Amino acid sequence: LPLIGVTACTKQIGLHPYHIAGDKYLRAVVNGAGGLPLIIPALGESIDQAALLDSVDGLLFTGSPSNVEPRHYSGPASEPGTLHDSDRDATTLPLVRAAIDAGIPVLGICRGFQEMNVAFGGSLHQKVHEVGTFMDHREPADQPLEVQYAPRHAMHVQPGGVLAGIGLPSEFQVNSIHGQGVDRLAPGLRVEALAPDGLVEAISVEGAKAFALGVQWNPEWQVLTNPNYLAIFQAFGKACSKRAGQ
Amino acid sequence: SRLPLIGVTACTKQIGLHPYHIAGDKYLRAVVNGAGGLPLIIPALGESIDQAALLDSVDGLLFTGSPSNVEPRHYSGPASEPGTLHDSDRDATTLPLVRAAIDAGIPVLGICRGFQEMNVAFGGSLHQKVHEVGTFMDHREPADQPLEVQYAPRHAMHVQPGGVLAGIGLPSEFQVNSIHGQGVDRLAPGLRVEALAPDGLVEAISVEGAKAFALGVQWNPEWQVLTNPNYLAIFQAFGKACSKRAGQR
Ligand SMILES: N[C@@H](CCC(=O)O)C(=O)O
Numbered sequence: 495l496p497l498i499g500v501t502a503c504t505k506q507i508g509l510h511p512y513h514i515a516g517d518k519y520l521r522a523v524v525n526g527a528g529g530l531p532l533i534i535p536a537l538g539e540s541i542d543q544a545a546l547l548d549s550v551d552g553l554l555f556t557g558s559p560s561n562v563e564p565r566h567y568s569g570p571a572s573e574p575g576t577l578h579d580s581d582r583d584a585t586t587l588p589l590v591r592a593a594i595d596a597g598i599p600v601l602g603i604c605r606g607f608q609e610m611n612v613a614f615g616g617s618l619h620q621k622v623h624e625v626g627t628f629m630d631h632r633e634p635a636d637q638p639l640e641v642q643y644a645p646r647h648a649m650h651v652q653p654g655g656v657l658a659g660i661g662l663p664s665e666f667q668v669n670s671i672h673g674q675g676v677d678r679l680a681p682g683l684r685v686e687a688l689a690p691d692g693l694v695e696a697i698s699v700e701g702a703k704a705f706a707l708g709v710q711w712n713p714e715w716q717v718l719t720n721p722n723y724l725a726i727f728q729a730f731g732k733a734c735s736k737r738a739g740q
Numbered sequence: 741s742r743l744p745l746i747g748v749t750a751c752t753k754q755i756g757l758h759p760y761h762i763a764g765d766k767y768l769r770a771v772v773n774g775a776g777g778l779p780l781i782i783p784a785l786g787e788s789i790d791q792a793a794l795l796d797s798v799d800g801l802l803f804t805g806s807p808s809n810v811e812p813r814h815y816s817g818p819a820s821e822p823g824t825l826h827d828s829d830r831d832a833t834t835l836p837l838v839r840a841a842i843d844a845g846i847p848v849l850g851i852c853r854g855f856q857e858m859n860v861a862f863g864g865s866l867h868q869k870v871h872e873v874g875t876f877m878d879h880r881e882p883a884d885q886p887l888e889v890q891y892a893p894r895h896a897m898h899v900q901p902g903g904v905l906a907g908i909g910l911p912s913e914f915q916v917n918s919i920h921g922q923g924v925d926r927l928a929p930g931l932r933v934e935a936l937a938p939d940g941l942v943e944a945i946s947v948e949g950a951k952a953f954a955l956g957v958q959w960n961p962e963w964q965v966l967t968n969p970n971y972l973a974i975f976q977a978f979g980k981a982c983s984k985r986a987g988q989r
């Protein structure tokens with residue numbers, strides 16, 4: 495089994511600080527990518543990043559309720575109350591760039607897709623639903639997970655990239671659990687898919703030595719019941735297996 | 741030299757509507773600072789994982805402390821009192837993993853709950869309330885105190901000669917912190933007592949005949965490990981064992 499590192503978030507739980515990761519991301523690595531998920535703590539520069547990269551066969555940058563701090567893309571200060579995770583930002587943004595340069599497969603989901611865009615020099619809309627023209631991409635409030643993570647808008651694959659290459663249909667439906675989204679696309683990123691309002695919702699890293707894909711939706715959700723989500727996780731898993739085989 | 745990849749056991753926690761796997765920052769920083777390793781957190785996924793693949797992927801394992809308690813059915817103990825904190829998903833991960841790791845020669849360090857896991861995994865039992873048995877001190881942390889006091893040294897620890905701790909050179913007595921309501925009752929077969937609290941409670945064990953480093957301690961040596969040499973020595977010994985395994989990669 496390939497060793498797939500999964501990014502942690504930080505959280506104070508009672509008296510103590512913790513590093514946490516969502517069960518559903520870990521189960522998707524097992525059930526969809528065929529990998530062994532181990533959680534990468536959000537320790538930033540305290541860890542030798544190069545040693546961390548040498549030790550994993552791929553990286554999953556997970557979603558999170560928190561938001562990339564806008565200073566990393568020279569954005570406007572966030573509204574009071576906005577959730578941030580500075581320790582995660584300090585870990586993931588340098589890790590993305592280093593992983594892609596070293597040829598470690600990368601899959602970014604939701605916040606992790608936003609991280610990929612910011613890490614390569616792009617910017618975000620902090621409230622897509624207040625921009626105008628764009629849909630409200632947030633999940634419905636006061637609903638169970640099954641409703642929040644159900645398919646809610648279409649997704650239009652752009653030919654000639656990773657998603658077309660794995661054989662996804664030209665249009666398929668995706669879930670949508672995000673209040674932020676891509677504003678300026680980072681240089682060197684290929685657009686892989688667009689929402690029907692034109693929002694960029696998937697990207698790949700041009701010229702990357704290994705699999706390097708980010709998606710704005712949440713394909714870890716019940717991955718075995720969605721052939722499109724599963725196809726993405728299986729392609730990521732194959733790339734990780736390639737690395738593990740060395 | 742290859743930094744050893746040290747797996748650190750997670751606990752489960754429901755946060756809102758989502759289940760999470762969690763691990764304490766102070767354990768992870770002790771792996772970096774004290775053992776010289778790269779910590780990755782092992783989810784509490786039980787049988788959903790190929791345990792053999794997990795063992796092949798790590799150079800050592802740290803079984804962490806936790807507020808939760810091993811479920812007493814695993815040592816045929818009486819049902820726990822109402823409200824006792826348990827983590828059945830962690831138990832389903834760690835008890836088989838301990839045995840398999842030591843059988844395969846993967847270095848193991850167990851701290852507090854993780855030391856209790858080691859004793860239970862090999863067939864031993866626990867006292868669910870050490871402070872109520874009658875012959876032990878109260879080994880829990882003091883109630884209305886901040887962490888720096890709760891995790892400070894609070895009782896002595898007496899090394900039993902001839903084992904891992906004496907081999908590390910630790911003194912015959914040293915002070916340790918104490919943040920635990922449970923403790924060893926019956927030692928498991930195949931375990932060597934390494935140290936006793938002054939009341940006689942077994943607070944450290946090693947596995948007889950293990951191919952590789954296999955140590956559990958009931959105190960919490962991750963706490964401020966860098967400035968406590970008696971704690972640091974344990975993490976340094978663990979880290980050296982993990983590095984030996986990494987060198988066979
Ligand atoms: N907080 C970010 C990421 C969401 C997520 O990963 O679920 C947003 O609202 O877009």
Ligand SMILES: N[C@@H](CCC(=O)O)C(=O)O
Nearest residue numbers: 805806852853920921922
């Ligand atoms: N809950 C267990 C373990 C404590 C801990 O690991 O901190 C006890 O009270 O003994």
Ligand SMILES: [Mg+2]
Nearest residue numbers: 631669670671
């Ligand atoms: Mg959307």
Ligand SMILES: [Mg+2]
Nearest residue numbers: 879917918919
């Ligand atoms: Mg004690």
